[PDB]
Design a protein around this ligand. Structure first.
Ligand SMILES: Cc1cc2nc3c(=O)[nH]c(=O)nc-3n(C[C@H](O)[C@H](O)[C@H](O)COP(=O)(O)OP(=O)(O)OC[C@H]3O[C@@H](n4cnc5c(N)ncnc54)[C@H](O)[C@@H]3O)c2cc1C
Ligand SMILES: Cc1cc2nc3c(=O)[nH]c(=O)nc-3n(C[C@H](O)[C@H](O)[C@H](O)COP(=O)(O)OP(=O)(O)OC[C@H]3O[C@@H](n4cnc5c(N)ncnc54)[C@H](O)[C@@H]3O)c2cc1C
Ligand SMILES: CO/C(=C\C(N)=O)[C@H](C)[C@H](/C=C/c1csc(-c2csc([C@@H](C)/C=C/C=C/C(C)C)n2)n1)OC
Ligand SMILES: CO/C(=C\C(N)=O)[C@H](C)[C@H](/C=C/c1csc(-c2csc([C@@H](C)/C=C\C=C\C(C)C)n2)n1)OC
Ligand SMILES: [Mg+2]
Ligand SMILES: [Mg+2]
Ligand SMILES: [Mg+2]
Ligand SMILES: [Mg+2]
Ligand SMILES: [Mg+2]
Ligand SMILES: [Mg+2]
Ligand SMILES: [Mg+2]
Ligand SMILES: [Mg+2]
Lengths: 464, 464
């Protein structure tokens, strides 16, 4: 259905841009999500030839690479989100955002089922764009999600402060010696990837740069462990850099735990195992005030539910396996991009950003084809008209290390433009992250956020 | 300290500045609150000759004038607050803040009982500076607390935005010609002092500027009413100005209800009554989605608690009555300033920023007279010393109106510098306010707020 006067998420709003007919003139494309995929895919697609619809529980778009800077308020949570709406005021034709969530996609009955928590109730789709993202992975390691914080989404950032704020508080009522005070003030990040390292760093920044400047008795006793399973951190960088980073984290009093896996999280301590290069399996408990879980990504119910309803997708695990034109293997009119598509690619923004932009332009290709105005094998039409299959141009990797330092690589093709570095690198990272932001609103807010951060402390209000 | 926690809540910070002999000879001074009076008094007290400690459940100062511009993201709630610590960090001597609330003042036992919501538990004092503010008042009109929203404190801003969004949301799923949609978009501000005005003003902005740019279907139907019991809005501005303000309010589509009083408040609607030129009371139902009740202050219960414990304050209705030396009539060592003090002046912030600065210089002027500590018309102690009493240098009256306009009136004694005006006044007004802000950080943040507003919309997130 998907008609007038229902109840999904209340920003089920329609923007009557151009002048269409009531007899359906265009294909109804329906996007799932409002993140990198869906916003990148929306940002380009020809709205004159297609009737774009978006289904997102979230009504803003998240510039994920600056999220780890939110909790301490290096950046404000607003300063890095954008409403979907503003990207639709930049589309010539017609859009509609339902503020709900996909639940079961019904591939052959040909709808996405939106049931919200803010109320049929399905939505007809001619084509489907499935960029819902991955949800983070605990590995069945018990205790996470009882006692952990995922660094995924804006609320997650608010939860992490409120927690750390509350510990800083409780902690400052105990006599200096007390171990408990020592515990409250400890931080465990679990995740050696960029996210974790950046959170790890951004906290330690705050503690050195801000906290001590008015309660130095606490600053000291703050401890920030960073825990990773593999031989070293930042594995996407060439060995020589990953080391400089690990140098600089420990330089900033970070307790890096390489080759270490979390077997279980209890309330106050997380039982860790370590397997050394001389294969010796040692144990260790790590007590924690605040636990951050910056690791992994698994598939979502919508998708793992879909796996069954498409014979080819029975045994895909990571995401939806996709052919070279990014359609679901097993379905005609259903596509998948970014973290929920299994392209055999890095699960990153860069990939999803390209993935979407290519698919966007291929949608302009198909409109020129009368053959696509109507018609269980599927790819055929993409060959008959000579469509380029998607190939990826991995552009390199940035990561921020703490107390004003960074490392990076940039590339195009086999060519490898640049690679830092230290305090210089920092200013590119800033200058570069700025440019990759998808809105002038957001960028000015972040810009102002860093200028403000020079003259003054971060804003660490627990109720805001 | 040490460990003096028993009543007082978490952010019990202490700055170990000067070297303190356990057994002290400096007097001990207590400031109740963290707003205009208290923070003004904190700023100008000599922290070397005295020892100052504070009690406030609120860990931040609030630039109360800008509050009404936060609910519609004209300005961020963080931009207008600044922490106590941040002020106390720029002092000479030892400051301490027990983040809690006074529950009982104990005049004849020299203590203030503090039961923090977050936890004996008395605090000892030589001198007491009672500056807790007043609370807002319902005049026992049934319904206000249930369905209404005060506009007194930061959380109230979030409460309103949340409310208004949820209605904008719920309304857009109903068809243009529904009553229930008309209602949800109705907005009644009760009380036409510059608050209710500026508020009403700043909403209509968001409707007229933000909302319409993406839902004119909703925007148009949004109605803002301003109810006021008196002949005119903004009585403290001179007669001719009150009419131009009202001209401009009504001319920006704001239904202004003079000589009108809210007899009661129900969920969907509020019954109001209006006395006419001819002295005949009519009735009326105003149905409403959002109810901002910005009218009249009343006596805090700690202040009312302390009316029974002093014979002079037995017939004290409005607030603690004080002499020309701002001292609680009937106590020696307690002082009341701000809206908890009934100094027969208006309950402005302007008053309190004077009431403080003055008392601080008094307090400093009690550092060349070594008899007070070797001490029934106890104001004579000051009169015989030849203490200049307190006099209010009324600096004026400001009020923003909506849609880029403002009214103003700077003066001193009689010598009136100015009285506008239009788009020029809005600019001055901005400038005056921006100057009167108490911290660099607040200022800058407020300054970048306004810039971002010219470039981009406002920020109306219902979870941030
Ligand atoms: C803290 C953090 C920092 C990162 N930093 C970087 C970086 O610096 N560089 C980099 O390349 N990558 C980074 N990433 C990874 C990158 O952001 C992701 O790979 C990218 O977000 C994938 O985009 P996507 O569109 O596939 O999914 P997302 O961007 O996650 O978008 C998924 C969207 O779908 C919505 N949604 C969820 N469930 C449903 C449902 N059932 N129905 C409808 N909609 C739904 C979500 O609200 C969201 O809008 C980071 C990730 C995190 C968590
Ligand atoms: C939205 C709004 C806008 C305004 N704009 C203006 C304006 O432009 N110009 C103007 O002159 N006036 C304005 N006012 C009025 C003016 O701000 C007040 O008269 C002024 O705040 C009084 O200051 P105060 O120090 O007496 O109390 P406040 O400034 O309210 O501060 C009182 C403090 O006491 C704390 N507190 C309360 N109870 C307790 C307790 N039991 N124990 C400990 N602490 C406690 C509070 O958290 C607060 O920090 C405005 C008021 C509002 C609500
Ligand atoms: C906006 O478009 C872009 C560049 C441009 N000049 O416009 C880029 C595509 C832009 C930047 C991408 C980018 C910057 S920096 C970075 C990065 C750092 S690290 C990483 C990968 C290798 C990490 C993946 C981790 C995955 C886990 C979930 C397992 N990617 N990606 O896309 C967001
Ligand atoms: C310039 O600095 C100041 C004093 C000084 N330097 O001595 C002031 C205290 C300054 C501004 C005060 C101000 C601005 S605008 C205003 C005012 C006049 S009137 C009013 C209404 C809102 C409040 C109460 C009215 C009560 C009855 C008269 C109805 N507000 N007062 O600090 C905030
Ligand atoms: Mg995203
Ligand atoms: Mg997406
Ligand atoms: Mg994702
Ligand atoms: Mg995805
Ligand atoms: Mg205040
Ligand atoms: Mg005060
Ligand atoms: Mg007050
Ligand atoms: Mg007061």
């Amino acid at each position: 259905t998907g008609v007038e006067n229902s109840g999904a998420g209340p920003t089920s709003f329609k923007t009557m841009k151009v002048i269409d007919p009531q007899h359906s003139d265009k294909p109804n494309v329906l996007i799932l999500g409002s993140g990198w995929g869906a916003i990148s895919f929306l940002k380009h697609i020809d709205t004159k030839k297609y009737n774009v619809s978006i289904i997102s529980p979230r009504s803003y778009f998240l510039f994920t690479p600056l999220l780890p800077s939110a909790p301490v308020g290096t950046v404000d949570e607003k300063s890095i989100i954008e409403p979907i709406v503003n990207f639709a005021l930049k589309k010539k034709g017609n859009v509609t955002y339902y503020e709900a969530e996909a639940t079961s996609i019904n591939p052959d009955r040909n709808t996405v089922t939106i049931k919200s928590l803010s109320a049929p109730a399905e939505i007809k789709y001619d084509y489907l764009i499935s960029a819902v993202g991955a949800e983070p992975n605990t590995f069945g390691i018990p205790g996470v999600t009882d006692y952990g914080h995922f660094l995924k989404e804006i609320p997650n950032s608010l939860e992490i402060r409120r927690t750390f704020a509350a510990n800083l508080e409780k902690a400052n009522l105990l006599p200096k010696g007390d171990p408990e005070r020592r515990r409250l003030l400890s931080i465990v990040v679990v995740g050696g990837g960029p996210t974790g390292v950046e959170a790890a760093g951004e906290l330690q920044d705050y503690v050195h740069q801000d906290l001590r400047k008015f309660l130095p008795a606490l600053a000291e006793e703050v401890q920030i462990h960073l825990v990773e399973a593999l031989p070293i951190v930042l594995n996407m960088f060439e060995k020589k850099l990953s080391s400089y980073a690990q140098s600089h984290l420990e330089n900033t009093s970070i307790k890096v735990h390489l080759r270490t896996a979390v077997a279980k999280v209890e309330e106050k301590q997380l039982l860790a195992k370590t397997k050394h290069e001389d294969g010796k399996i040692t144990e260790e408990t790590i007590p924690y005030g605040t636990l951050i879980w910056a690791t992994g990504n698994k598939a979502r119910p919508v998708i793992t539910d879909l796996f069954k309803k498409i014979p080819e997708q029975n045994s895909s695990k990571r995401g939806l396996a996709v052919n070279d034109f990014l359609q679901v293997k097993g379905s005609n009119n259903i596509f998948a991009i970014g973290d929920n598509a299994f392209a055999g690619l890095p699960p990153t923004a860069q990939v999803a950003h390209q993935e979407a932009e290519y698919l966007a332009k291929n949608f302009d290709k198909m409109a020129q084809i009368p053959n696509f105005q109507k018609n269980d094998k599927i790819d055929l039409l993409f060959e008959e008209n000579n469509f380029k299959p998607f190939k990826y141009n991995d552009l390199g990797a940035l990561a921020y290390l703490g107390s004003e330092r960074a490392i990076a690589t940039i590339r195009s093709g086999k060519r490898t433009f640049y690679t830092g570095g230290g305090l210089m690198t920092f200013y590119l990272w800033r200058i570069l992250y700025l440019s990759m932001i998808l809105s002038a609103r957001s960028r000015l807010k972040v810009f102002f956020d860093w200028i403000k951060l020079a003259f003054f402390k971060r804003d660490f209000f627990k109720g805001l």
